[PDB]
Design a protein around this nucleic acid. Structure first.
Ligand code: ZN
Ligand code: ZN
Lengths: 201, 201
DNA sequence: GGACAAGTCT
DNA sequence: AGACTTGTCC
């Protein structure tokens, strides 16, 4: 019963926040994150490991959801899905358990469930929260983005926001992280150009 | 029974040759033809009228066939079709009587038949030959191209040639014209840029 | 990693 | 029409 998913950040009572693994500063990296602009640059299909920080262990059954939304307040009501060209292309959507209409996927997990809202048609992927591996404190989730930010008919060059929520079994929103996501072929140069464009402006 | 349609020219015993009309020299023209390079520049979907020079009246039932082929000797055997993106797009392929997979269409003609080679898969559109309208010497066919020369999944930035053949009822190739075809959003500037890149090379 | 290429915004 | 943008070649 939520048409326009709320993008506004909300650190849950468990200090909800997401960070990233020092993506290779080189222009060759398959992904990179800009904390200044708070935007994630990722190559299509290429795996993107996300660090999730949890300060208070949540009630078991609690899960994390990833949902793509549109940043353009004019397209914010439109559902984000894979490109119509990519929705069919046998390259990746032919052997994966993930539906070919979902933009975001999760690599390396079977408990991951892909859901299509019946009333809102919103695509999203959820995974039950896992305890940080022995020794470390952050948990890691591997996400895939099966569409460039420029694909024709899908997200026609219009930016998006990735909504990572921390829900419980019934669906109560506890923590909510958000960041703009740009999927391109050269995440490095695009990040650089966006930061330099950020200063002199 | 022709896998790799022959591209080279072959005037028939009816002096087979194609020409064009005004070619609004301005860069705004939806289409423009270069006789120097012998290449056609056209905007996607926009109508391109082709003048067919018929010399000796051919046998009744004779038809003309437009077929797109790849100029790259590497992709030549690959069948040219609309990009998977455009094959779905509700833009044009939703109310037209032409298959959503065919690159070349004919506008303003119900006698036009769109055929897929069952053994080769080649797309092509055939229209029965019409007598030059009263008074004039040129018969005209209105062709449409529903895929840029840069679309994704289809003819991705690799050039093509348009094969216009004059066949009879059974299919004997009487006349065969050919010219490279570029579908872009700025046919004027691309024509100029190619014609200048021609001498400085 | 630089530069060409080509669709689109303004 | 000029120029930006962004995927892709080299
Ligand atoms: Zn796509
Ligand atoms: Zn197309």
């Amino acid at each position: 019963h939520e048409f326009i998913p709320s993008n506004t950040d909300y650190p849950g009572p468990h200090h909800f926040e997401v960070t990233f693994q020092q993506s290779s500063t080189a222009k060759s990296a398959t992904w990179t994150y800009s904390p200044l602009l708070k935007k994630l640059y990722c190559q299509i299909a290429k795996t993107c490991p996300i660090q999730i920080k949890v300060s208070t262990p949540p009630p078991p059954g609690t899960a994390i959801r990833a949902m793509p939304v549109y940043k353009k307040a004019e397209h914010v009501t439109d559902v984000v899905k894979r490109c119509p060209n990519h929705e069919l292309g046998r390259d990746f959507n032919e052997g994966q358990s993930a539906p070919a209409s979902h933009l975001i996927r999760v690599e390396g997990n079977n408990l991951s469930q892909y859901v299509d809202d019946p009333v809102t048609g919103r695509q999203s992927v959820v995974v039950p929260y896992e305890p940080p591996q022995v020794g470390t404190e952050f948990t890691t989730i591997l996400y895939n983005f099966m569409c460039n930010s420029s694909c024709v008919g899908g997200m026609n060059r219009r930016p998006i926001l990735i909504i990572i929520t921390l829900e419980m079994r019934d669906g109560q929103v506890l923590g909510r992280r958000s960041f703009e996501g740009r999927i391109c072929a050269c995440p490095g140069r695009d990040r650089k150009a966006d930061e330099d464009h950020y200063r002199e402006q």
